[PDB]
Amino acid sequence: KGPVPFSHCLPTEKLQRCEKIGEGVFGEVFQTIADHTPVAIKIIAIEGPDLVNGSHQKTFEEILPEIIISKELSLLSGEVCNRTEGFIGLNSVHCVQGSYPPLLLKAWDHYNSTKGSANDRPDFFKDDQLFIVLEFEFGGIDLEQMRTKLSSLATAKSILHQLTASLAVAEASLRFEHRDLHWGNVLLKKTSLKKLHYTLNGKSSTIPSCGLQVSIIDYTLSRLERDGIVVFCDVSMDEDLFTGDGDYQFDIYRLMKKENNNRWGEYHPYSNVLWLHYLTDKMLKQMTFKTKCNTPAMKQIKRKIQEFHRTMLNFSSATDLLCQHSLFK
Numbered sequence: 577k578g579p580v581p582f583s584h585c586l587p588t589e590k591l592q593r594c595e596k597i598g599e600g601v602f603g604e605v606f607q608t609i610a611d612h613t614p615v616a617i618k619i620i621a622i623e624g625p626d627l628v629n630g631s632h633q634k635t636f637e638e639i640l641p642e643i644i645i646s647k648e649l650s651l652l653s654g655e656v657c658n659r660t661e662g663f664i665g666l667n668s669v670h671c672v673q674g675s676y677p678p679l680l681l682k683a684w685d686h687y688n689s690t691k692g693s694a695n696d697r698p699d700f701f702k703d704d705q706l707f708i709v710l711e712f713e714f715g716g717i718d719l720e721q722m723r724t725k726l727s728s729l730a731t732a733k734s735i736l737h738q739l740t741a742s743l744a745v746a747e748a749s750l751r752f753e754h755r756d757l758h759w760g761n762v763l764l765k766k767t768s769l770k771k772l773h774y775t776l777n778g779k780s781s782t783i784p785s786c787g788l789q790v791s792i793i794d795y796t797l798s799r800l801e802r803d804g805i806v807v808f809c810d811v812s813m814d815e816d817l818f819t820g821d822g823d824y825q826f827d828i829y830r831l832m833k834k835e836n837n838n839r840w841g842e843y844h845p846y847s848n849v850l851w852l853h854y855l856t857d858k859m860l861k862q863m864t865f866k867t868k869c870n871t872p873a874m875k876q877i878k879r880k881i882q883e884f885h886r887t888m889l890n891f892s893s894a895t896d897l898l899c900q901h902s903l904f905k
């Protein structure tokens with residue numbers, strides 16, 4: 577009941593350890609350390625009248641749906657009938673009031689000097705500015721940035737299997753559609769577990785990890801429901817979203833609109849299949865692997881992912897894919 581200073585979420589040592597790891601129009605993301613453990617901090621300026629990164633700031637009401645979705649998906653990790661850890665874990669959410677911390681400005685500058693930013697330097701906010709600060713588990717590095725960094729198509733298959741299981745569990749539990757699962761929104765980090773665990777409608781199984789754990793992020797466009805109350809981003813009046821070019825990503829927006837007849841409140845889990853198909857297309861055409869497929873077992877994996885690419889679009893949901901596709905048997 578009432579906003580807190582930045583110091584409540586980001587005391588001095590946590591601020592001193594912030595390094596920027598990502599950005600977009602409606603968010604800056606920093607990695608920091610709490611109790612010897614990496615965490616990701618997303619910060620969003622809200623409720624103010626000033627343009628930020630070329631756009632108006634979100635109101636609390638416009639951003640709340642995305643926070644609700646975050647929480648619901650995170651909670652799946654502690655469920656029973658429909659359990660997955662494949663969505664980014666949400667540790668805390670605060671509403672903060674203050675000027676941007678100078679230590680954060682220093683981390684912002686460093687990223688701008690080294691990687692380059694499309695954002696405004698966040699130095700013009702006044703001491704009445706509101707922010708939402710979200711603390712997430714640290715999810716690693718996105719698939720796009722790992723384009724040339726994965727061992728083999730065995731790794732690609734673990735990723736696709738993880739993604740398919742996480743989405744199926746979310747379909748089953750929450751009638752979830754991600755709706756924007758481009759390869760910037762698939763995060764990869766090292767795990768020492770050989771096998772990862774999920775439960776889909778009460779039936780548990782495992783996925784060989786190939787040394788990686790996948791986390792799904794960014795619910796800008798996502799949709800889910802509980803007890804008939806639907807949380808979604810109504811893009812029926814957006815034009816720009818559907819006129820992009822130069823990447824299959826931009827056809828996927830058009831194909832979702834075709835599937836749902838521009839009715840974004842409806843549940844069309846085929847959109848998850850569309851995204852998984854885009855991801856499979858990236859694995860086969862844009863990713864490049866350290867070790868190519870040279871042994872029997874490896875060539876078979878390659879042929880199976882190829883077969884997944886040309887067949888998966890005849891399945892109706894991630895649930896259907898996980899339970900019926902030969903790639904996962």
Ligand SMILES: COCCOc1ccc2cc1OCC(=O)N(C)CCCNCc1c[nH]c3ncnc(c13)N2
Nearest residue numbers: 597598599600603605616642714715716793794795
């Ligand atoms: C309302 O909030 C809903 C939750 O959405 C997000 C949760 C966590 C996120 C990013 C989320 O949305 C997209 C966004 O804000 N970007 C700035 C673009 C992508 C940046 N990722 C960078 C990244 C690298 N390692 C990470 N480990 C954990 N979380 C991360 C990242 N990002």
